[PDB]
Amino acid sequence: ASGMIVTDAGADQPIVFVNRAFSTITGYAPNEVLGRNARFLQGPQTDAATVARLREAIAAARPIQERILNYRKDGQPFWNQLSISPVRDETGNVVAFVGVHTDVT
Amino acid sequence: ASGMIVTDAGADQPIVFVNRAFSTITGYAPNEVLGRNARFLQGPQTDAATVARLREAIAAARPIQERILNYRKDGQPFWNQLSISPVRDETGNVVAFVGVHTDVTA
Ligand SMILES: Cc1cc2nc3c(=O)[nH]c(=O)nc-3n(C[C@H](O)[C@H](O)[C@H](O)COP(=O)(O)O)c2cc1C
Ligand SMILES: Cc1cc2nc3c(=O)[nH]c(=O)nc-3n(C[C@H](O)[C@H](O)[C@H](O)COP(=O)(O)O)c2cc1C
Numbered sequence: 001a002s003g004m005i006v007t008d009a010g011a012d013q014p015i016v017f018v019n020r021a022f023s024t025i026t027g028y029a030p031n032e033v034l035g036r037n038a039r040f041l042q043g044p045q046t047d048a049a050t051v052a053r054l055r056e057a058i059a060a061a062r063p064i065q066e067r068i069l070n071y072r073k074d075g076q077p078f079w080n081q082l083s084i085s086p087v088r089d090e091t092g093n094v095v096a097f098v099g100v101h102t103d104v105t
Numbered sequence: 106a107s108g109m110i111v112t113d114a115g116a117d118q119p120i121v122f123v124n125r126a127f128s129t130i131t132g133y134a135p136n137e138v139l140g141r142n143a144r145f146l147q148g149p150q151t152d153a154a155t156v157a158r159l160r161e162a163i164a165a166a167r168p169i170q171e172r173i174l175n176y177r178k179d180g181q182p183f184w185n186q187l188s189i190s191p192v193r194d195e196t197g198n199v200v201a202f203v204g205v206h207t208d209v210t211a
Contacts (some may be wrong), residue, residue: 002194004201006122008153009153015124019201065195082194089107089205090170090186096109096124096204100194 005038005099012037013058013097022083024078025103027073036100041070045077054084061086061094067104079104110143110204114173118163118202119205128183129206132178143204146175150182159189166191166199172209183210 003022007013014035023029026041033040042051046069057064063085070080081104089098108127112118119140128134131146138145147156151174162169168190175185186209192201 002198002200004192016124019121019198083195086188087109087203087205090209091186091207093107095107095126095205096203098192098201100192100200102194102196 003099003101005101007038007062007097009094009096016096022101025072025078025101026070032073032079037052041080043069043071043075044076045069055083057084058097061088061097080104107133108204108206110206112143112202112204114166114201121201127206130177130183130206131175132181137178146185148176148180148182150174159187160205163189163202166193166202183208185209 001021004019004104005015005022005027006017007015009056015033015038018030050066050068066081068082069077073076081102084097084099086094087098089095106126108130109124110120111122112129113118118186120138120143123135123138133171155171155173173185173187174182176182186207187204189202189204191199192203194200
């Protein structure tokens with residue numbers, strides 16, 4: 001099953017919602033991630049260039065997909081196939097971001 | 106501000122998340138809507154042909170935009186500029202639906 005992360009659009013894109021599969025994949029319960037930026041999933045072997053592409057895409061509200069090394073709550077690394085898209089209203093304002101992720105280890 | 110509704114993909118699309126603007130626009134608190142299909146926003150002056158287009162688009166997981174007459178919790182009508190899109194994983198599976206809505210009553 002594919003995880004889903006919804007964040008606010010501004011400040012530092014705090015997580016406001018995760019689905020069941022997010023917890024299955026990452027080992028984190030919703031209560032311990034809500035209000036945090038999803039970058040806590042990253043760790044020592046995460047590719048910095050991949051992180052920088054995500055950072056630029058979110059800043060510009062551009063859709064992006066990456067395969068990124070993430071870490072479960074218990075510290076185990078896994079390959080996360082991640083897609084992020086902005087959610088926009090009719091006037092083009094960004095309301096939220098939505099991420100979908102799949103463990104492709 | 107623009108409301109956002111997230112629903113499950115399956116089983117008549119129950120609401121799983123709303124943002125604060127959803128409550129400002131509709132008068133419903135999250136507790137009052139979680140687990141329900143968003144059609145409780147409709148009422149007797151809602152255009153049946155618009156509802157049909159929504160029904161067919163959601164069943165097909167096709168993005169759709171419509172202006173639809175909706176009703177606040179206490180019954181006040183408002184025009185809802187609504188856009189609904191599926192959320193897909195890399196294999197194309199629909200994970201959720203996301204709706205963004207604005208009160209465009211003149
Ligand atoms: C909706 C959404 C979902 C995200 N999901 C993930 C994720 O699953 N894994 C990850 O490493 N980063 C994820 N990110 C990216 C980080 O939150 C952050 O944007 C990224 O690391 C770049 O920013 P930084 O350089 O400030 O950390 C997500 C971001 C958004 C907006
Ligand atoms: C994510 C999402 C958000 C929705 N938001 C609204 C809304 O704001 N107003 C509305 O009248 N219907 C909304 N709907 C549409 C109804 O939930 C429903 O799909 C539509 O009325 C057609 O179905 P029916 O004939 O089975 O009621 C939304 C649906 C989804 C999936």
